[PDB]
Structure formats: C-alpha cells, structure tokens
C-alpha cells in the first residue's frame with residue numbers, strides 16, 4: 001500500500017557532482033526521453049456521487065368516490081370509498097408540475113350526485129406526490145430501489161410494486177441514468193515511438209492521474225459510456241473513435257472482470273488539490289533549500305538528500321554521499337511498492353502491490369557508522385529506512401480505498 | 411518511527427454534534443533545527459489530576475402551541491406548532507428538580523381551545539432536562555465545551571450557542587485545583603549547544619505540549635508552586651534548583667505581565683497564521699466542515715482533517731450509528747510503526763520505547779469499525795488516515 005519512486009537498477013554508475021545544476025523538483029520532465037511519443041485525447045472523469053441525481057417522486061393515484069344510493073324509498077344513503085389505481089404518465093406529469101409549483105391540492109371527496117331508483121356515483125381522481133429518493137447502478141445505467149418491479153428500472157416513469165404508485169425521477173432529461181458527476185479532462189498517452197502501440201507499452205497521465213500503467217488498465221463501461229479503469233481503480237472516458245498512433249485506442253484494452261467497480265477521482269477533491277499544491281511548493285522549496293546547503297558547503301543529511309529524489313517515475317538523477325562527496329547518477333525512476341517506511345531487507349514489489357519482492361538496491365556506500373544509498377536511503381541496524389515523504393499511499397493504487405471512500409451521515 | 415498526536419485515552423465520552431460550531435484546531439508543527447541539544451527536566455502539571463469530564467444538564471424551553479382556527483365557516487382547522495424559547499432560571503430549577511425526582515413529563519400538545527370568528531391558541535410551557543457532559547479547564551477548573559458561548563463557563567447557569575438552551579453543572583463545587591497532587595511530567599528543552607543558553611534560544615516540548623517558544627515563555631507562580639508559563643497559556647512547575655547546560659533554568663525568563671492568567675481552553679490569536687502547514691491544516695478542517703454543512707458524505711480522511719495534529723487539549727471526532735460525534739480529549743505525542751498496523755498499539759514514551767494499546771472503543775462503520783479521527787479497524791489491519799502523520803534522528807546527521 002506504500003509506494004515510492006525509486007531507481008530501477010540496484011546499482012548505478014556514480015560520478016561526483018561538479019556543475020551544481022539544480023533539477024527541482026526531480027522528474028522525467030527535465031530529461032528528453034527519445035523513443036517516447038505523447039498524444040492526448042479529450043476525456044471525462046467522475047468527481048463524486050451527487051445523490052440529487054437520483055431524487056424522485058412517488059406518484060400515487062386513487063379515485064375518491066362519493067356514491068349516492070336512492071332505491072324504492074328511505075333516507076339518502078351516501079357512502080365514501082377510495083380506489084387505488086395506477087396513474088398514467090400524463091397524470092403523474094401534471095400532478096408533479098402542480099406539486100413543484102405548489103398547485104397540487106387534496107380536494108377530498110366529490111359532492112353528492114343523487115338520483116332516484118338508481119345508485120350512481122361521482123368520482124375525483126386524486127394524485128399524491130411523495131418525494132422518494134432511490135439509488136443508481138452507475139455500471140448498468142438504471143435506477144435501483146426495493147420499491148421497483150424487479151428492484152430496478154431504467155425509464156422516466158418506473159413501475160413500483162404497489163398498484164397505486166409509480167416513480168418519477170425529479171429530472172426527466174432523457175439521458176443516461178447516473179448518480180455521478182463528471183469533469184472534462186485532457187488525458188495524455190505516452191508510448192514508445194518506434195514499437196507497435198499496445199496496452200502494455202502505454203502510460204496514461206492527466207492532471208489527476210500520475211503515471212498510470214496501461215498494462216494494468218482495463219476497459220469498462222461507466223455511466224453509459226466507454227472508458228478505462230486505471231490500476232488505481234479510477235476511471236476516465238474513452239470512445240471507440242479516439243485514435244493513438246493512427247489506431248483505435250480503446251480496443252487495445254481488455255474488458256474489465258465482471259463486477260469491477262470504479263472510484264471517484266480522488267485528486268479532483270478540493271482537500272486533495274490543497275494538499276497537492278502545498279506539497280508541490282514544499283517539494284520545490286525543500287529541494288532548492290538542500291541545494292542551498294550544498295552551495296554554502298554545508299554538510300548534507302540523508303533527509304536533505306531525499307529532498308532531491310524524484311517522487312514520480314521517469315528518467316532522472318539520483319544523489320548520494322560517497323566518502324563525504326556529493327555524487328549523482330543517471331537513472332530511470334520507477335514505481336515500486338515497499339512493505340513499510342522501515343524494512344528488514346532492501347527489497348520491494350516492482351510490478352504491483354501484490355507482486356513479487358525483489359532486490360531494489362544493493363550498492364551501499366560508507367556513510368559514517370552506517371551505509372547509505374540513493375537519495376538518503378539508510379542501511380542501519382534497525383533496518384532500511386526511507387524518509388516518510390518519499391512514500392505515498394492511497395493515490396496511485398486502490399490499496400487504501402476504505403480510507404478515502406465517502407459515506408453519508410445520519 | 412512515525413510521530414503522531416493521538417488522544418491519550420483508548421476510549422472517550424462521545425456526544426453528538428448537530429450544533430455546528432466549526433471548531434478547527436491549530437495546525438501541526440514545523441521543522442526544528444537538527445543540530446539542537448536536548449536536555450529534559452522533571453516537572454509537574456494539573457493535567458491528569460483535574461477531572462477531564464463534568465456532568466450537567468441542558469435545560470431547554472419550548473412552548474407547545476395548539477392553534478384553533480374558526481373563521482366564517484368550514485371545518486375546524488387545528489394546527490400544532492412548537493416555539494423554542496429561552497428558559498428562566500426558575501423554569502430550569504423547577505424542571506431540574508422534577509427531573510431528579512422523576513416528576514418531569516412532557517405534556518405533549520395542549521387540548522384544542524376553539525372559538526368562533528377568532529383564531530385563538532392554547533400553549534404548554536414544556537421544559538426539558540437532558541444530561542449533558544462537558545470538558546474541564548485543567549488549570550482553572552472552568553467548564554470547557556463548544557456548547558458554551560465563548561467556549562467556556564464558570565457559573566451556576568451557563569449560556570449556550572443554542573439561544574434556547576441553558577447548561578447547568580451537576581456539581582457546582584468546581585473542585586480545588588491547587589490542593590491536588592500534580593501529575594509528574596517530563597519537559598524536554600531544546601537549545602543550540604554552541605551558544606550560551608538563553609530564553610530566546612529555547613524550545614520546550616512534552617508529551618502534552620507541542621513546541622513552545624522560550625522567547626515567549628515567562629516565569630509565573632501558580633498554586634504556590636514556582637513555574638513557567640508557555641505561550642499557549644499552560645503552565646509547568648519549575649524551581650530554581652533545576653540546571654540546564656550547567657546553569658539555572660528558571661531565571662532565564664522574565665516575570666509574567668501584571669495579571670497573567672494561566673488557562674487551558676480549546677483555543678488559548680485573531681489574524682490568520684502565516685505558517686504554511688497551519689494554513690493547510692486549517693483549510694482542510696474547514697473543507698471538512700464545508701462538507702458537513704452541505705450534508706455531503708464523509709470519508710475517514712475528511713474526518714481526520716478535524717483532528718489536532720500536535721499535542722494539546724482538543725476534540726476528537728468519530729461516527730456513531732451514522733451520527734457525527736465528538737469528544738473532549740488531550741492529544742499526546744505518540745509514535746506509530748506505519749499507517750497500517752496489525753494491533754491498535756503505539757509508543758507513548760519514546761520511538762525506541764514499547765507499544766501499548768492506544769484505542770479500544772470501536773464503533774460499527776459499515777462492514778468496518780471506526781475509531782477517533784478516521785482511524786479504521788478493518789480485516790486488513792488498523793488504518794490511520796495519512797493526514798494524521800503529516801510531515802528519526804538518523805535522517806538528520808552530518
């Protein structure tokens with residue numbers, strides 16, 4: 001559940017830092033990756049469940065009947081009954097409009113309509129609108145509530161179990177049934193310019209999605225439109241028409257396992273944007289501050305070194321202190337999952353959080369009493385230590401969804 | 411390995427929040443200079459002696475009104491309303507006596523009082539008494555709770571944020587703080603080793619106190635005991651015998667200004683902080699409250715935004731039977747092995763110390779169980795919202 005961006009190779013070719021040029025913050029953006037080509041497409045991503053999208057009304061219909069019985073003689077025998085009937089769509093529409101405008105009034109029983117030697121009755125068709133909220137299957141695109149026939153419905157005039165009432169969505173806009181709000185989003189595809197385009201050789205980026213492995217990306221239809229679910233369980237829209245390397249992009253992806261679910265794009269949340277922005281400025285300024293320590297010829301701590309590390313995958317540089325000397329090394333950072341901020345063995349899972357653990361770094365340098373690695377990785381008696389800030393959780397994987405999944409109150 | 415600030419008790423006395431007070435705690439701490447020498451001295455504090463909870467009663471007054479409308483003709487139109495009003499002291503006294511004796515019964519709605527060509531109504535003055543506990547000022551013994559106007563009260567009758575409710579303490583003795591046996595507390599002092607130690611070069615901290623700037627810390631006698639008063643209004647004992655850097659510590663600090671009051675409320679201070687972490691934390695808290703007011707669904711992470719991230723007197727939050735609930739507590743420094751734990755344990759004394767249970771009362775939270783400030787008890791372990799960690803001595807060397 002804990003991920004880091006770390007140099008792929010367990011050993012790097014180190015050289016002493018001389019020119020002192022600052023790459024803050026460290027990322028693949030600074031370095032031109034030759035074989036890489038990028039292409040973007042307009043997309044859409046779910047940013048949260050808005051329950052009002054499934055607000056409804058129970059349209060009840062019942063004839064109120066005043067019956068006058070006048071036989072041979074005797075008093076005027078008047079009875080009052082009520083007969084539940086199923087409303088037409090027109091009845092429900094008119095009565096709902098009346099309800100919204102505040103016109104709908106329960107007028108009660110009809111006035112007595114009497115004759116002689118004949119029992120005739122007069123009736124008032126009474127509609128009662130009881131606001132009822134129902135759920136939504138975003139995946140199958142229909143309403144869902146126990147009151148429905150079959151426990152579900154996909155119309156604008158749904159039939160309930162009770163003969164008297166039906167259900168009308170408060171929004172009858174003839175579009176997709178969805179309990180989810182979206183936002184437009186440019187999604188960018190990165191792939192090897194030379195090789196043939198394929199799901200495994202694609203990486204997705206967006207303002208909300210950091211280096212998302214197409215190889216662990218599957219196809220899924222959400223809220224009535226085609227898209228792809230990323231390895232972190234988040235989803236962006238993608239139509240069959242969109243081409244990448246002059247080929248249909250969508251069919252490159254395996255359909256998602258039946259019953260696959262999709263989460264709201266966490267990074268679009270305001271709390272998340274605040275945290276992100278503050279972290280951005282802090283990463284930058286802490287990097288610059290470390291390089292200021294270097295400039296002032298001050299000694300460097302492992303933490304200071306870690307402020308130079310790349311926090312995202314990409315071609316970059318790593319830094320360490322070999323024999324009291326600041327050294328850099330070219331490398332390609334990749335995403336790895338580690339077992340904790342402090343580890344027993346210098347291993348990590350390289351393909352997925354449930355993948356196989358492999359040696360991630362083995363080239364340790366004499367750093368005082370202990371050994372040090374790239375970007376202030378510590379080899380100590382208490383184990384192997386990463387600085388907590390290099391570690392991420394609950395963003396690039398679905399391992400901690402329980403923590404960020406929102407639930408209503410009361 | 412990861413320092414956090416967590417309620418010192420494995421269980422707390424939870425109350426609902428429908429009041430909407432919008433309390434946000436002061437944010438986390440920032441980096442300190444890594445080359446700092448640390449020397450700790452033994453001290454003491456009422457924190458631990460003084461009770462943390464105080465039982466009382468909300469006295470709510472409401473007029474139950476049955477209204478009869480009889481105009482020109484037509485049926486008898488009867489309506490039923492309820493008007494919240496502020497109770498008198500007499501109303502509260504009588505109703506509280508009735509409550510204690512078990513006499514107090516809600517009279518429901520008054521019987522219909524009808525006339526003709528005149529809409530007249532009959533009303534019942536229903537006073538309701540509800541047991542309701544509040545926090546306590548550790549140093550003054552005052553009552554501390556968001557319910558109170560100004561957050562605190564020390565009177566026999568207490569005004570609340572509810573204009574119709576009045577809080578009444580069950581025991582109006584307020585104890586005797588000074589007489590108590592003050593809890594022993596270790597106070598850590600950080601200073602520049604390569605300088606002559608001075609007030610302006612000192613940072614205090616303890617399991618109870620986030621970083622306190624010595625430059626704003628003054629000598630102040632409290633309950634007859636010599637001591638020092640942190641900028642947050644709290645106080646710890648310190649006599650002249652205590653040496654730091656082979657030198658008298660206490661005389662390094664000026665006397666407290668005329669009539670300095672040592673307090674311990676929820677706040678303890680008006681313009682926005684300029685500290686980036688504090689601004690962030692504040693913004694996140696407020697974001698969660700925005701969610702609450704908009705009646706939007708809440709994640710455990712959102713909940714965590716409401717928590718204090720530094721040691722100090724504060725509130726913890728949780729969700730009990732779908733009700734957003736809060737409790738008074740003290741946040742204390744602890745150390746946690748990581749965000750996901752096999753046992754709900756943490757280190758209370760030192761990162762090199764031992765683990766102990768830190769949370770016990772779990773509330774059903776769907777298929778999971780939730781604790782304070784978003785702490786989840788799940789099949790896959792005990793999961794802390796990563797916010798609570800926020801920002802090891804091996805990492806800071808050479």
Ligand SMILES: *[C@@H]1O[C@H](CO[C@@H]2O[C@@H](C)[C@@H](O)[C@@H](O)[C@@H]2O)[C@@H](O[C@@H]2O[C@H](CO)[C@@H](O)[C@H](O)[C@H]2NC(C)=O)[C@H](O)[C@H]1NC(C)=O
Pocket residue numbers: 730731772773774
């Ligand atoms: C939460 O409270 C419930 C009781 O209230 C329930 O939820 C309300 C919203 C309302 O709908 C009530 O009608 C519900 O019953 C506790 O459940 C029971 O509590 C009573 C009283 O203590 C007890 O007799 C039952 O045995 C409880 N049920 C069981 C088997 O535990 C429940 O304990 C509370 N939940 C937690 C985790 O504190």
Ligand SMILES: *[C@@H]1O[C@H](CO)[C@@H](O[C@@H]2O[C@H](CO)[C@@H](O)[C@H](O)[C@H]2NC(C)=O)[C@H](O)[C@H]1NC(C)=O
Pocket residue numbers: 494495496573
């Ligand atoms: C709430 O607080 C004050 C009292 O502290 C209220 O003052 C009166 O409250 C009664 C309640 O029955 C009202 O009927 C009166 O109209 C109020 N009087 C006046 C002129 O203030 C007040 O309702 C609320 N806040 C204020 C100060 O307006």
